[PDB]
C-alpha cells in the first residue's frame, strides 16, 4: 500500500484535504526514509514536506500520523547538519517535546529518538533542545521505581538521547542541565542492560571531558566505583566508554585521580594494558600517563599494582600510538617520581624499549623519551650511578640513537640530545 511511493505521490497525499490520505502518504514517506541504502532525505526536504510532518506531530486526534511523521522527521534529523537543521527549522523541537508526554509509548519514544538526533548534531541544537525544555519531560520518562519495567528499546533510546544532551564541547552542556541529568545518569549506570550501560558511560565520558569542575560534578555523584566496575566488564562497548570516562577523570586533580585509584581501577590495568583491542590499550596507557603525572604516592600505587612491567611491555610492543602514550606515562613517572621509583622503573627494563623508540619518525615521542632519559640520569646523579646507566643505554644501542639525534633538525631534540651526550657520553 505505502511501499515504494514516489516523492510526488507523497506530496500529492500530504497536500490532499484528507487526514487519511495524509496519513498514508506520511507512512509512505516514512517507509522511504527508512530504507538506508541512502534514504531520499533531500528529496523529502526539497518537496517542502517538513512543515507538514511537523504539523502532523500536533495531531493528537491522529496518533498514527504523529508517529509516522515523528519517524519521518527522526530520519531526516539523522542526516547531515543541514538535514537536522531542516527539521529544527520546521519547529520540530517544541513539537517533539510535546510528544514526549504522548500516552503512546511508541510515539513518545519516537519523539525521544528525534530529539536525540537533533541534540546529536552538536552543541547548538543540543542547547536549543535543552532551552525548549526537553530535559524534564525526558527525565520524567525515567521516573519509575525500577527501570526494568520499561521496554528495553525504549530505555535504550532515552539513555542514548540523554547521552547526546551530555555530549559535545564547544561549549559543554549547561551546568544546570548537567546537574539535572546526572542523577538519572547515575541510575542508568546501575542498570543491567549493556547498551544502557555503554551509553551511560558515554554520557559520563562526555561529562568528564572538560575542566576539573566538570570532572568534579560527576566525581561528586559517587560514580567512580561503578565506572571502575564497568571497566572490568566483558563487553568492549561498555569498557570503551568506562575507560574514556576514567581517563578523563584522571586528567583532573590529583584528588579526582585518587578517587579512581581508591575505587580499585589500577587492578584492571594489567588487562587493559594488554587488551587485544588497540584503542583500549592506547586509552589505558593514556590513563596510566595521567596517573603517573600525579603524586609520588600515586606513582607508588602504580608500582604496587605491578603496572610498571605492563608499561614496559606496552613500550616494548604496542601499536605506535599506545607506545607514545607509554612514553608519556614514563616521562611523567620520571618527572614526578622519587629516585627509588625511578630506579625501580629501570630495574623493570625501561631503558632498552625507551631507546628502541628513539628510532621513531615522530618528533614529539623523541622529545618525550630524551626527557625521560634526562629525568632518569638526574635520578642516577642523585646516586652516582650515571656511569652504570650510561653503559646500559650504550649496550642496548641507545647511545648510537642519541648520537644520531644531534643531526636531528629540531630545536629541543638536538639540544636535549647534545646535552645528554656532552653531559654523560
Amino acid at each position: 500500500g505505502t511501499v515504494n511511493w514516489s516523492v510526488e505521490d507523497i506530496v500529492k497525499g500530504i497536500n490532499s484535504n484528507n487526514l487519511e490520505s495524509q496519513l498514508q502518504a506520511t507512512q509512505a514517506a516514512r517507509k522511504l526514509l527508512s530504507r538506508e541504502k541512502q534514504p531520499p532525505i533531500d528529496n523529502i526536504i526539497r518537496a517542502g514536506l517538513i512543515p507538514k510532518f511537523v504539523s502532523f506531530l500536533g495531531k493528537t486526534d491522529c496518533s498514527p500520523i504523529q508517529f509516522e511523521s515523528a519517524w519521518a522527521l527522526t530520519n531526516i534529523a539523522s542526516g547531515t547538519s543541514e538535514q537536522t537543521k531542516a527539521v529544527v527549522d520546521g519547529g520540530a523541537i517544541p513539537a517533539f517535546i510535546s510528544l514526549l508526554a504522548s500516552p503512546h509509548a511508541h510515539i513518545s519514544e519516537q519523539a525521544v529518538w528525534a530529539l536525540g538526533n537533533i541534540a546529536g548534531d552538536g552543541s547548538a541544537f543540543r542547547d536549543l533542545v535543552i532551552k525548549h525544555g526537553a530535559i524534564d519531560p525526558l527525565l520524567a520518562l525515567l521516573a519509575v521505581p525500577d527501570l526494568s519495567t520499561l521496554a528495553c528499546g525504549y530505555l535504550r533510546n532515552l539513555t542514548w538521547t540523554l547521552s547526546n544532551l551530555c555530549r559535545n564541547k564547544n561549549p559543554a552542556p549547561p551546568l544546570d542541565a548537567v546537574e539535572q541529568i546526572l542523577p538519572t545518569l547515575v541510575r542508568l549506570l546501575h542498570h543491567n542492560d549493556p547498551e544502557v550501560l555503554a551509553d551511560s558511560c558515554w554520557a559520563i565520558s562526555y561529562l568528564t571531558d572538560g575542566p576539573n569542575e566538570r570532572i568534579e560534578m560527576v566525581v561528586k555523584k559517587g560514580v567512580v566505583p561503578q565506572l571502575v566496575k564497568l571497566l572490568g566488564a566483558t563487553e568492549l562497548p561498555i569498557v570503551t566508554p568506562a575507560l574514556r570516562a576514567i581517563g578523563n577523570i584522571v586528567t583532573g586533580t590529583d584528588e579526582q585521580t585518587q578517587k579512581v585509584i581508591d575505587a580499585g581501577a589500577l587492578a584492571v590495568f594489567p588487562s587493559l594494558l594488554t587488551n587485544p583491542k588497540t584503542n583500549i590499550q592506547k586509552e589505558a596507557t593514556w590513563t596510566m600517563s595521567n596517573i603517573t603525572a600525579g603524586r609520588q604516592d600515586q606513582i607508588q600505587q602504580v608500582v604496587n599494582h605491578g603496572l610498571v612491567p605492563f608499561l614496559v611491555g606496552v613500550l616494548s610492543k604496542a601499536d605506535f600510538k599506545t607506545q607514545k602514550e607509554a612514553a608519556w606515562a614514563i616521562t611523567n613517572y620520571t618527572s614526578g617520581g622519587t629516585v627509588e621509583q625511578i630506579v625501580y622503573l629501570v630495574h623493570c627494563g625501561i631503558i632498552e624499549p625507551l631507546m628502541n623508540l628513539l628510532s621513531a619518525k615522530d618528533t614529539k615521542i623523541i622529545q618525550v623519551i630524551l626527557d625521560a632519559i634526562s629525568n632518569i640520569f638526574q635520578a642516577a646523579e642523585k646516586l652516582g650511578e650515571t656511569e652504570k646507566l650510561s653503559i646500559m643505554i650504550e649496550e642496548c644501542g641507545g647511545l648510537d640513537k642519541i648520537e644520531a639525534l644531534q643531526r636531528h633538525e629540531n630545536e629541543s631534540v638536538y639540544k636535549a640530545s647534545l646535552n645528554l651526550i656532552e653531559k654523560y657520553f
Binding site: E36, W71, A77, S78, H106, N117, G122, D199, R244
Partner: peptide, 12 residues
Amino acid sequence: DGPTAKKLKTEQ
C-alpha cells in the same frame, strides 16, 4: 568519542 550521534530508524 565515540558512538554515533545520529541514528536512522529502519524498523519499528
